[PDB]
Amino acid sequence: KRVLSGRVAVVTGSRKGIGLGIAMRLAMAGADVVLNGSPEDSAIVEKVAAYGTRVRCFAANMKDRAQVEALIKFTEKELGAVEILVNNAGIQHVSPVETFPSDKWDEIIALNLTSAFHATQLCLPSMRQRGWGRIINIASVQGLVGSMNKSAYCAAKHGLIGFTKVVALETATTGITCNAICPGYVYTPLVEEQIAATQAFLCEKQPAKAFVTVEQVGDAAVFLASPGADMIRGTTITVDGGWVAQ
Amino acid sequence: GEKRVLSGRVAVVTGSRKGIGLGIAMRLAMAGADVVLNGFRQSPEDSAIVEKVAAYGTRVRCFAANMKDRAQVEALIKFTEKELGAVEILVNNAGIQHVSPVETFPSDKWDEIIALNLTSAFHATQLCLPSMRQRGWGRIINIASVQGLVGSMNKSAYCAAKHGLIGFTKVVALETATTGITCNAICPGYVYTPLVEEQIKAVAEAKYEAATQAFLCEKQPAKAFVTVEQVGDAAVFLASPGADMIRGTTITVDGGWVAQ
Amino acid sequence: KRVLSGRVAVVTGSRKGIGLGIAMRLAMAGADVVLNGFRQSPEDSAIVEKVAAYGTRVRCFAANMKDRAQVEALIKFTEKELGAVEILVNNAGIQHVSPVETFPSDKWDEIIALNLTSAFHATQLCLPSMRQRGWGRIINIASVQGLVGSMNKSAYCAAKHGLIGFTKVVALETATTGITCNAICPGYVYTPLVEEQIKAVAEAKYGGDMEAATQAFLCEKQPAKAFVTVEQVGDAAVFLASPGADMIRGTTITVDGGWVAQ
Amino acid sequence: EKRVLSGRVAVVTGSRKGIGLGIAMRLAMAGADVVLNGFRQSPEDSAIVEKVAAYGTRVRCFAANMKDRAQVEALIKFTEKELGAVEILVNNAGIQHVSPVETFPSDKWDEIIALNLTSAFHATQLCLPSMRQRGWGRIINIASVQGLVGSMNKSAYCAAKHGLIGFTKVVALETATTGITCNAICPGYVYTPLVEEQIKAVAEAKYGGDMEAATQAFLCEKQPAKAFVTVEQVGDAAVFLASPGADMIRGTTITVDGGWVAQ
């Protein structure tokens, strides 16, 4: 059939942007998918279901451990065990450090690190029992280098890469792998608001002078979830048009 | 006597009544800096530790503040400003550890490690930067770990927090790059702390020295400990004029851990 | 799902081990492939047959990659036989284990020349056509030893680090084009070379016991306590050559069982 | 006598100008005896020796083609004869050539690899036995930001400097249980005659001869501090790595780059 046929994937933060694109590519590769995050919502789900797999949606606030638990238990009831966990936070706040609001710092750290930790903690026992798993953490180039005015985001994304390494090491002798994807600039509403002058925005950071697409990030997730990635453990797949190469 | 390289600079070291932080405070004072020490709560030992650091002829204070409470961080900075003057060197060091597999890692310990090892550094840096910018000079020295560059089993929260602290260091350095303020991180490997010394003595009596060798062999190719004095020496180097253009980087003091 | 149908690939050092696994996976994905080795072999045919089992056009060409004129001959042979080179896999596959003090000068030079300068020459020779056509993939087979050091592998670590540096520059010089350049960084792969290393360890330390020696050899560096396979390296190559990788540029795909994560 | 490197004997390759001269001067300031080195004898040699000798230590100068292993060995033997055992070896080799990969001349590629990488291997190989016998040593390899990241039109140099960092790690690991350390320093753009030459070439080709404009563009592209690193700062990093506080710094990079690799 298809490379991920039968596999059950959960994508946190899959309502729009990168998370939705990852969900689409996973379903396109054959995975059943749970979208976390209402007529428009039904339209979005139908679009994911166009790839012929079982699609579900859930509305867990990823900052509340009880609701993350409910997301996992919902998936187990509906589709069976969570085999592919994609930790995708999807929030940003741009500010110099001196005026960076404390609550925005806390929110970015909470949703990138602590939420990924709680979801992973809840999913690992089943994956160990079943002898297989994929934890795919959606980091950023900002998890490998710094950028001005993105202190909380760079700290959170660096942290998520560190977490990734530890989870991979603790599972290295199993059928479970944990890795991170590090996208450069992807065309999203936030990036559109910051910005013709697309070229100046890209030229500063992204030598390809073009955007990464949500499809390309999804393709990286599919690769990490494939059998050819069985021995890819604790690493980054950077999809960034050359950002980190310079 | 003669002026030393950091003479006249006021430094604040968090978590500096013992271990690595105390070693850093000692070396900064030896290099001529005034120093404010810090811990979570007042202890009977504060006077003796203050006088140990003050043996090198600089002004030394101690201020107890829970670094997880932004208001107490602010109080530490304001206390330093009132007692000694503007904070010119900030060393973010207070940190805790908890070893556990990810599946059973307690939620409260995860939160504490993130709060102290990463978010407290953010608060203190935010509070010190405006004065540094006004004066045109500063040093922010973040005490990370090898665990901020690589992973280790059963240290998920610590590796996440220390990686995050390195990311933060990069951003602060970039936002200040055209000024006389630098921000950098030091990344120690296994350091011979009093706690580590106790553990080694206990293991060497019970099962044996060779205890040291077994503990270090996995991770630290030198098969020897880093000392708190060496970490302090790295802080003095970053604080010195020769490091005016070292920005956003790591000084790894780890006996070869990250090299392999 | 033959994502490389229509594309012509050249894999250097591809009659054994990792190069052969990469060539096999490229052909399976639909690429026409040119195999290469230093000197021709009577068994070449059999090896070629295996690759051609996947139904693409397969050729073989013997070129000493340390001789620029022979690298040029390989590229011109491919252009005449199959068409323009679209996927270049630079794969050297040589090793010498020794402490620095006694490391032979000739072995140092040979490791630098084949790992690094040969990839430079082949890339030089392939880029004009790929710029003219507007598409290309240059895939450099580095190592974990291009990201970290290991004892007694000074030349190999230097060469593999240098190959990663070269990868970044090529990627930056082509970033606005349809040409990408990236590196794959394998850990320990079970290949005859690594088996020789293990045999040396077994004789020196374990009474010749290859099972004990293999476990000690893997546990030193590779947390998975298992080998990476040549098929896995080839899968990474197919991923880099695919359209999902159009914006993967100047980076490393590390396939190492956790080696660099710790 | 009270300076941190007093009595240590240091060899700095490529040290009659630029970064290497700055390193030699700072080592001497720190109390080290220093051997200077360049490709061929120059009428300016005595004035440079005087510059380094201003700090009251012993200084020598030896001309040696660092691509010739026999001349590297002669440099080491000369030092042993004149000053004593080589205790600090600074492998410094700034040779650069800027070209796109497609037109990069093969002989320039070969030269950059030979000098920026293979010469360091030979010199290290020749110095390690004495350092092992004495139980102390420093091997300080002058890499670059270009050993950690790439830059356009610097394929050979980026490859050579990345290789030198890899070499550094291996040497440090093979000596990790001894008093010998090996580390690399990674400068960004440093204010030196060679870098000014590179900026001038760009100024003529793209900025109408305007050195100010070319310098601003050069720095803005890569170096967030928008200022040069100085040879004195690179030398200060060498003194730090050579000092007792660096006894457990092994196989790492000290990056002095105004923020280049941080972004």
DSSP A211: P
- Label residues D109-130 b or e (16+ Cβ within 10 Å = b): bbbbbbbbbbbbbbbbbbbbeb
Name every chain A residue with its beta carbon within 8 A of the beta carbon of B111. Answer: 114
Question: Are A130 and A107 spatial neighbours (Cβ–Cβ below 8 Å)?
Answer: no
> Is C3 part of any domain?
no
Give me Rg for the CA atoms of chain A.
Answer: 17
- Known binding residue A186? Answer is yes
> Is A244 part of any domain?
no
Q: Is residue B219 located within the same domain as residue B230?
A: no
Q: Which residues of D are catalytic?
A: 157
Rounded Cα–Cα distance for residues D133 and D136 (Å): 8
> Is A43 part of any domain?
yes
Q: Do B164 and A156 touch (CB under 8 A)?
A: yes
CA distance B229 to chain D (A): 7
> Is A1 part of any domain?
no
What six digits make up the tokens of C30? 């639909």
Rounded Cα–Cα distance for residues A181 and A171 (Å): 18
What six digits make up the tokens of D240? 């730090």
What's the burial of B130, exposed, middle or buried (CB within 10 Å: 0-12/13-18/19+)? exposed
**Secondary structure (3-state) at A96:** coil
Question: Are B247 and D253 spatial neighbours (Cβ–Cβ below 8 Å)?
Answer: no
- Its sign, for the CA torsion C137, C138, C141, C143, is negative
Rounded Cα–Cα distance for residues C113 and A224 (Å): 33
HEC letters along chain C: CCCCCCCEEEECCCCCHHHHHHHHHHHHCCCEEEEEECCCCCCHHHHHHHHHCCCCCEEEEECCCCCHHHHHHHHHHHHHHCCCCCEEEECCCCCCCECHHHCCHHHHHHHHHHHHHHHHHHHHHHHHHHHHHCCEEEEEECCHHHCCCCCCEHHHHHHHHHHHHHHHHHHHHCCCCCEEEEEEEECCECCHHHHHHHHHHHHHHCCCCHHHHHHHHHHHHCCCCCCECHHHHHHHHHHHHCHHHCCCCCCEEEECCCCCCC
What six digits make up the tokens of B151? 């992973």
Neighbours of A101 (CB within 10 A): 11
Show Cβ contacts of residue C166 under 8 Å, excluding neighbours closer than 6 positions. C116, C119, C120, C123, C140, D155, D158, D159, D162
**Nearest C-alpha neighbor of A28 from the set A56, A5, A57, A61:** A5
Pairing outcome for strands A55-58 and A32-36: parallel
B260 near C CB under 8 A:
yes
- Known binding residue A149? Answer is no
Which of A109, A167, A170 is nearest residue B119 as measured by Cβ atoms? A109
Q: Phi and psi dihedrals of C11, rounded to 5? A: -115, 120
Question: Are C217 and C204 spatial neighbours (Cβ–Cβ below 8 Å)?
Answer: no
- State the DSSP string of B168-234: HHHHHHHHTTTTTEEEEEEEE-SB--HHHHHHHHHHHHHH--HHHHHHHHTT-TTSS-B-HHHHHHH
- Known binding residue A148? Answer is no
Which of B150, B259, B260 is nearest residue C261 as measured by Cβ atoms? B150
Strands (E), chain A: 8-11, 32-36, 55-58, 84-87, 133-138, 176-183, 236-239
> Is C167 part of any domain?
yes
Q: Which domain holds residue D202?
A: 191-227
Q: Is residue B72 located within the same domain as residue B132?
A: yes
Q: Is residue D181 located within the same domain as residue D204?
A: no
What six digits make up the tokens of B175? 């936002």
Q: Is residue C86 located within the same domain as residue C149?
A: yes
Edge-to-edge strands, sheet with D59-63: D59-63, D33-38, D9-12, D88-91, D137-142, D180-187, D253-256
Rounded Cα–Cα distance for residues C22 and C184 (Å): 11
What's the burial of B7, exposed, middle or buried (CB within 10 Å: 0-12/13-18/19+)? middle
> Is C2 part of any domain?
no
Question: Are D141 and D129 spatial neighbours (Cβ–Cβ below 8 Å)?
Answer: no
The distance from CA A109 to its chain's CA centroid, rounded to whole angstroms, is 15
Q: Is residue B177 located within the same domain as residue B160?
A: yes
D162 near C CB under 8 A:
yes
Q: Is residue B88 located within the same domain as residue B214?
A: no
Rounded Cα–Cα distance for residues C19 and C36 (Å): 9
Pairing outcome for strands C8-11 and C87-90: parallel
Q: Which residue shows structure tokens 């303020």?
A: B181
> Is C261 part of any domain?
no
The distance from CA B142 to its chain's CA centroid, rounded to whole angstroms, is 6
Picking from C18, C215, C247 by the largest number of A CB atoms within 10 A of its own CB, the best residue to mutate is: C247
What six digits make up the tokens of C34? 């040119």
What six digits make up the tokens of C184? 């794959």
Q: Phi and psi dihedrals of C118, rounded to 5? A: -65, -40
D176 near B CB under 8 A:
yes
**Nearest C-alpha neighbor of D4 from the set D21, D35, D26:** D26
Q: Do A168 and C260 touch (CB under 8 A)?
A: no
Looking at the structure of chain D, the number of domains it has is 2
Rounded Cα–Cα distance for residues D31 and C242 (Å): 58
Name every chain C residue with its beta carbon within 8 A of the beta carbon of A222. Answer: 244
- Its sign, for the CA torsion D138, B23, B251, D171, is positive
- State the DSSP string of A108-155: HHIIIIIHHHHHHHHHHHHHHHHT-EEEEEE--GGGTS--TTBHHHHH
Q: Is residue D102 located within the same domain as residue D220?
A: no
Q: Which residues of C are catalytic?
A: 156
Rounded Cα–Cα distance for residues D140 and B233 (Å): 18
**Nearest C-alpha neighbor of C19 from the set C4, C34, C29:** C34
Rounded Cα–Cα distance for residues C91 and C18 (Å): 8
The widest CA-to-CA distance across chain C, in whole angstroms, is: 58
| Closest alpha carbon within chain A to B111 | A114
> Is B1 part of any domain?
no
> For the domain that residue D122 is a member of, what is the CATH number?
3.40.50.720
**Nearest C-alpha neighbor of D11 from the set D116, D127, D113, D171:** D127
**In chain C, which among 86-145 make CB contacts under 8 A with chain D?**
99-101, 103, 105, 108-109, 112, 116-117, 120-121, 123-124, 127-128, 145
Name every chain A residue with its beta carbon within 8 A of the beta carbon of B119. Answer: 105-106, 109
- Its sign, for the CA torsion D158, D219, B241, D50, is positive
DSSP A62: T
Rounded Cα–Cα distance for residues B138 and D202 (Å): 35
B218 near C CB under 8 A:
no
Rounded Cα–Cα distance for residues D97 and D109 (Å): 8
Instruction: Tell me the structure's resolution in angstroms, rounded to a single decimal.
Output: 1.7
Question: Are C50 and C74 spatial neighbours (Cβ–Cβ below 8 Å)?
Answer: no
- Its sign, for the CA torsion D12, D14, D17, D22, is negative
Q: Is residue C68 located within the same domain as residue C160?
A: yes
Which residues share a beta bridge with C184? C141, C253
C149 near B CB under 8 A:
yes
Show Cβ contacts of residue D152 under 8 Å, excluding neighbours closer than 6 positions. C169, C172, C173, D100
Q: State the distance between the two ends of chain C, measured CA to CA, in whole angstroms.
A: 36
Q: Do B221 and D255 touch (CB under 8 A)?
A: no
CA distance A232 to chain D (A): 22
Q: State the distance between the two ends of chain B, measured CA to CA, in whole angstroms.
A: 45
Rounded Cα–Cα distance for residues C36 and B153 (Å): 42
Which residues share a beta bridge with A133? A176
Picking from C98, C100, C115 by the largest number of D CB atoms within 10 A of its own CB, the best residue to mutate is: C100
Rounded Cα–Cα distance for residues C168 and A220 (Å): 20
Alpha-carbon dihedral B247, B249, B253, B257, rounded to 10 degrees:
-170
Rounded Cα–Cα distance for residues A81 and A136 (Å): 16
| Closest alpha carbon within chain A to C227 | A231
Which of B111, B118, B133 is nearest residue A155 as measured by Cβ atoms? B118
Q: Is residue B180 located within the same domain as residue B55?
A: yes
Q: Is residue C78 located within the same domain as residue C26?
A: yes
**Nearest C-alpha neighbor of A235 from the set C94, B188, C243, C232:** C232
Way it was determined: X-ray
Q: Is residue C48 located within the same domain as residue C67?
A: yes
| Closest alpha carbon within chain A to D151 | A246
CA angle B114, B119, B125 (to 5 degrees): 150
The distance from CA B82 to its chain's CA centroid, rounded to whole angstroms, is 23
Question: Are C197 and C97 spatial neighbours (Cβ–Cβ below 8 Å)?
Answer: yes
Which amino acid is it at B181? I
Q: Is residue D24 located within the same domain as residue D97?
A: yes
Q: Do D125 and C171 touch (CB under 8 A)?
A: no
Question: Are C17 and C226 spatial neighbours (Cβ–Cβ below 8 Å)?
Answer: no
Rounded Cα–Cα distance for residues C163 and C117 (Å): 9
